[PDB]
Design a binder for these strands. Structure first.
Ligand SMILES: Nc1nc2c(ncn2[C@@H]2O[C@@H]3COP(=O)(O)O[C@H]4[C@@H](O)[C@H](n5cnc6c(=O)[nH]c(N)nc65)O[C@@H]4COP(=O)(O)O[C@H]3[C@H]2O)c(=O)[nH]1
Ligand SMILES: [Mg+2]
Ligand SMILES: [Mg+2]
Length: 90
RNA sequence: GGUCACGCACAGGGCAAACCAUUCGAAAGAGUGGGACGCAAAGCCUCCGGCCUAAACCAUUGCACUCCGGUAGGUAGCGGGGUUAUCGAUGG
């Protein structure tokens, strides 16, 4: 069930999108070349983030290394992406 | 002459985008002064659609790459609608 993208939920929702990406990017750049980080704060898509990696191995690396990680007072709930991104599926 | 539409003007004007200064605001943004991009209602009003904001409240653990909660505020120079008003092409 591995994927280029990893799905994080259970995040402090009152963190601004602009800032939020960077906070993850600094934490997650260390595993591979991140193509893009998708973050929204709409009713459905808040408190959660998608991180797209260059390598699938790098997404696996990030997943098994930081599960439950205390991030903004909250544990990081990471799981694989069920479906790839529109930028990958091509 | 009203009145209701119309804008090809005349004459008298009026308002003031951006930007800057300053104040308020969490922000969008607004106030004031300077400034003029434009505007025949660019006068005034959030009732209706859009767009902008997200500090606090309230709900949501939620799988996206169209965008989307209530709540609240903003935009009348985003339309729509409302309401008042000016000049008057041998004007219609
Ligand atoms: N008195 C009067 N005259 C009218 C009216 N409608 C049309 N006109 C005449 O027609 C010209 C052009 O009007 P416009 O195409 O709406 O274009 C206008 C308009 O967009 C703008 N403007 C001037 N005054 C006002 C105003 O009080 N309100 C608004 N919204 N726009 C204005 O400047 C442009 C040129 O205006 P002008 O040099 O005065 O020249 C005007 C004026 O001579 C009206 O309701 N009243
Ligand atoms: Mg004139
Ligand atoms: Mg509205």
């Amino acid at each position: 069930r591995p994927n280029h993208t990893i799905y994080i939920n259970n995040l402090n929702e009152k963190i601004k999108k602009d800032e939020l990406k960077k906070s993850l990017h600094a934490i997650f750049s260390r595993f591979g070349q991140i193509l893009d980080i998708l973050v929204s704060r709409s009713l459905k898509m808040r408190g959660q983030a998608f991180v797209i990696f260059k390598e699938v191995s790098s997404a696996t690396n990030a997943l098994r290394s930081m599960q439950g990680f205390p991030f903004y007072d909250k544990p990081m709930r990471i799981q694989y992406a069920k479906t790839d991104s529109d930028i990958i599926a091509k």
